[PDB]
């Protein structure tokens, strides 16, 4: 002590918050396209008719 | 819905298929507010006339 005390430092306590992947587990396919847009087609074929 | 020794047994089916009408509308194939009980002893016959 005297003028000022001495110190022994222990390890740094790092509270760290994450946000784990719960919704990404249904999105498996990755597409790294360089073009502009992404075209889809959906076709419904009504056959159940008398 | 069987009793004990295979007695009085009932098999419950639920049918909600939907055909498209003659007038192009959705209609329930099996009637929804009703109960039908059919056996395999109806012995039905597919009739086919002349083309």
PDB file of C-alpha atoms in Angstrom:
ATOM      1  CA  UNK A   1       0.000   0.000   0.000  1.00  0.00           C
ATOM      2  CA  UNK A   2       1.530   3.283   1.112  1.00  0.00           C
ATOM      3  CA  UNK A   3       1.031   5.614  -1.837  1.00  0.00           C
ATOM      4  CA  UNK A   4      -1.403   3.192  -3.520  1.00  0.00           C
ATOM      5  CA  UNK A   5      -2.211  -0.491  -3.377  1.00  0.00           C
ATOM      6  CA  UNK A   6      -0.932  -3.372  -5.474  1.00  0.00           C
ATOM      7  CA  UNK A   7      -3.140  -5.730  -7.439  1.00  0.00           C
ATOM      8  CA  UNK A   8      -3.340  -9.361  -8.501  1.00  0.00           C
ATOM      9  CA  UNK A   9      -5.584  -9.673 -11.551  1.00  0.00           C
ATOM     10  CA  UNK A  10      -7.610 -12.791 -12.170  1.00  0.00           C
ATOM     11  CA  UNK A  11      -9.170 -13.761 -15.481  1.00  0.00           C
ATOM     12  CA  UNK A  12     -11.455 -11.434 -17.411  1.00  0.00           C
ATOM     13  CA  UNK A  13     -15.149 -12.210 -16.957  1.00  0.00           C
ATOM     14  CA  UNK A  14     -16.631 -11.814 -20.438  1.00  0.00           C
ATOM     15  CA  UNK A  15     -20.410 -11.902 -20.545  1.00  0.00           C
ATOM     16  CA  UNK A  16     -21.038 -12.717 -24.203  1.00  0.00           C
ATOM     17  CA  UNK A  17     -24.460 -12.894 -25.858  1.00  0.00           C
ATOM     18  CA  UNK A  18     -25.097 -14.942 -28.975  1.00  0.00           C
ATOM     19  CA  UNK A  19     -28.161 -15.677 -31.085  1.00  0.00           C
ATOM     20  CA  UNK A  20     -28.007 -19.281 -32.260  1.00  0.00           C
ATOM     21  CA  UNK A  21     -29.523 -20.642 -35.444  1.00  0.00           C
ATOM     22  CA  UNK A  22     -33.013 -21.968 -34.868  1.00  0.00           C
ATOM     23  CA  UNK A  23     -34.755 -20.798 -38.034  1.00  0.00           C
ATOM     24  CA  UNK A  24     -31.906 -21.443 -40.463  1.00  0.00           C
ATOM     25  CA  UNK A  25     -32.254 -25.218 -40.044  1.00  0.00           C
ATOM     26  CA  UNK A  26     -35.043 -25.311 -42.629  1.00  0.00           C
ATOM     27  CA  UNK A  27     -32.964 -23.433 -45.250  1.00  0.00           C
ATOM     28  CA  UNK A  28     -30.318 -25.927 -46.385  1.00  0.00           C
ATOM     29  CA  UNK A  29     -29.636 -24.888 -49.981  1.00  0.00           C
ATOM     30  CA  UNK A  30     -27.146 -22.092 -50.655  1.00  0.00           C
ATOM     31  CA  UNK A  31     -27.030 -20.374 -54.044  1.00  0.00           C
ATOM     32  CA  UNK A  32     -24.316 -17.802 -54.733  1.00  0.00           C
ATOM     33  CA  UNK A  33     -25.585 -16.240 -57.935  1.00  0.00           C
ATOM     34  CA  UNK A  34     -23.999 -13.295 -59.720  1.00  0.00           C
ATOM     35  CA  UNK A  35     -27.036 -12.430 -61.844  1.00  0.00           C
ATOM     36  CA  UNK A  36     -29.887 -10.099 -60.925  1.00  0.00           C
ATOM     37  CA  UNK A  37     -33.051 -12.024 -60.125  1.00  0.00           C
ATOM     38  CA  UNK A  38     -34.178 -15.564 -59.345  1.00  0.00           C
ATOM     39  CA  UNK A  39     -36.975 -17.036 -61.427  1.00  0.00           C
ATOM     40  CA  UNK A  40     -39.490 -19.544 -60.072  1.00  0.00           C
ATOM     41  CA  UNK A  41     -42.312 -21.367 -61.822  1.00  0.00           C
ATOM     42  CA  UNK A  42     -45.307 -22.880 -60.062  1.00  0.00           C
ATOM     43  CA  UNK A  43     -47.791 -25.058 -61.950  1.00  0.00           C
ATOM     44  CA  UNK A  44     -51.082 -26.370 -60.573  1.00  0.00           C
ATOM     45  CA  UNK A  45     -52.833 -29.002 -62.690  1.00  0.00           C
ATOM     46  CA  UNK A  46     -56.487 -29.547 -61.770  1.00  0.00           C
ATOM     47  CA  UNK A  47     -57.377 -33.129 -62.662  1.00  0.00           C
ATOM     48  CA  UNK A  48     -59.954 -34.114 -60.012  1.00  0.00           C
ATOM     49  CA  UNK A  49     -63.009 -33.204 -62.080  1.00  0.00           C
ATOM     50  CA  UNK A  50     -65.922 -35.242 -63.377  1.00  0.00           C
TER      51      UNK A  50
ATOM     52  CA  UNK B   1     -64.407 -50.203 -32.082  1.00  0.00           C
ATOM     53  CA  UNK B   2     -64.171 -53.918 -31.278  1.00  0.00           C
ATOM     54  CA  UNK B   3     -65.535 -55.598 -28.173  1.00  0.00           C
ATOM     55  CA  UNK B   4     -63.439 -58.231 -26.410  1.00  0.00           C
ATOM     56  CA  UNK B   5     -63.269 -61.439 -28.449  1.00  0.00           C
ATOM     57  CA  UNK B   6     -63.672 -59.966 -31.913  1.00  0.00           C
ATOM     58  CA  UNK B   7     -67.343 -59.237 -31.271  1.00  0.00           C
ATOM     59  CA  UNK B   8     -69.438 -56.336 -32.505  1.00  0.00           C
ATOM     60  CA  UNK B   9     -66.478 -54.669 -34.157  1.00  0.00           C
ATOM     61  CA  UNK B  10     -66.745 -51.418 -36.097  1.00  0.00           C
ATOM     62  CA  UNK B  11     -64.056 -49.949 -38.330  1.00  0.00           C
ATOM     63  CA  UNK B  12     -64.220 -46.164 -38.447  1.00  0.00           C
ATOM     64  CA  UNK B  13     -63.208 -44.415 -41.656  1.00  0.00           C
ATOM     65  CA  UNK B  14     -63.208 -40.676 -42.306  1.00  0.00           C
ATOM     66  CA  UNK B  15     -63.481 -39.482 -45.897  1.00  0.00           C
ATOM     67  CA  UNK B  16     -63.205 -35.856 -47.025  1.00  0.00           C
ATOM     68  CA  UNK B  17     -62.140 -36.108 -50.655  1.00  0.00           C
ATOM     69  CA  UNK B  18     -63.324 -33.219 -52.801  1.00  0.00           C
ATOM     70  CA  UNK B  19     -64.143 -33.690 -56.470  1.00  0.00           C
ATOM     71  CA  UNK B  20     -64.765 -30.775 -58.778  1.00  0.00           C
ATOM     72  CA  UNK B  21     -68.396 -30.278 -59.755  1.00  0.00           C
ATOM     73  CA  UNK B  22     -70.014 -30.453 -63.165  1.00  0.00           C
ATOM     74  CA  UNK B  23     -70.366 -26.680 -62.737  1.00  0.00           C
ATOM     75  CA  UNK B  24     -66.678 -26.396 -61.666  1.00  0.00           C
ATOM     76  CA  UNK B  25     -67.114 -26.054 -57.909  1.00  0.00           C
ATOM     77  CA  UNK B  26     -65.622 -27.826 -54.930  1.00  0.00           C
ATOM     78  CA  UNK B  27     -67.958 -30.467 -53.519  1.00  0.00           C
ATOM     79  CA  UNK B  28     -67.334 -33.050 -50.849  1.00  0.00           C
ATOM     80  CA  UNK B  29     -67.350 -36.584 -52.218  1.00  0.00           C
ATOM     81  CA  UNK B  30     -68.444 -38.229 -49.001  1.00  0.00           C
ATOM     82  CA  UNK B  31     -71.326 -36.259 -47.518  1.00  0.00           C
ATOM     83  CA  UNK B  32     -69.984 -34.439 -44.504  1.00  0.00           C
ATOM     84  CA  UNK B  33     -72.998 -34.371 -42.179  1.00  0.00           C
ATOM     85  CA  UNK B  34     -73.720 -38.065 -42.574  1.00  0.00           C
ATOM     86  CA  UNK B  35     -72.701 -41.569 -41.572  1.00  0.00           C
ATOM     87  CA  UNK B  36     -72.492 -44.375 -44.107  1.00  0.00           C
ATOM     88  CA  UNK B  37     -71.823 -47.992 -43.283  1.00  0.00           C
ATOM     89  CA  UNK B  38     -71.079 -50.317 -46.187  1.00  0.00           C
ATOM     90  CA  UNK B  39     -69.996 -53.955 -46.350  1.00  0.00           C
ATOM     91  CA  UNK B  40     -68.208 -55.907 -49.042  1.00  0.00           C
ATOM     92  CA  UNK B  41     -71.319 -58.029 -49.572  1.00  0.00           C
ATOM     93  CA  UNK B  42     -72.884 -55.314 -51.704  1.00  0.00           C
ATOM     94  CA  UNK B  43     -71.335 -57.292 -54.626  1.00  0.00           C
ATOM     95  CA  UNK B  44     -71.327 -54.333 -56.967  1.00  0.00           C
ATOM     96  CA  UNK B  45     -71.023 -54.588 -60.722  1.00  0.00           C
ATOM     97  CA  UNK B  46     -69.226 -52.238 -63.092  1.00  0.00           C
ATOM     98  CA  UNK B  47     -71.591 -51.912 -66.031  1.00  0.00           C
ATOM     99  CA  UNK B  48     -70.229 -50.847 -69.395  1.00  0.00           C
ATOM    100  CA  UNK B  49     -72.508 -50.302 -72.374  1.00  0.00           C
ATOM    101  CA  UNK B  50     -71.636 -49.930 -76.035  1.00  0.00           C
ATOM    102  CA  UNK B  51     -69.244 -47.406 -77.555  1.00  0.00           C
TER     103      UNK B  51
END
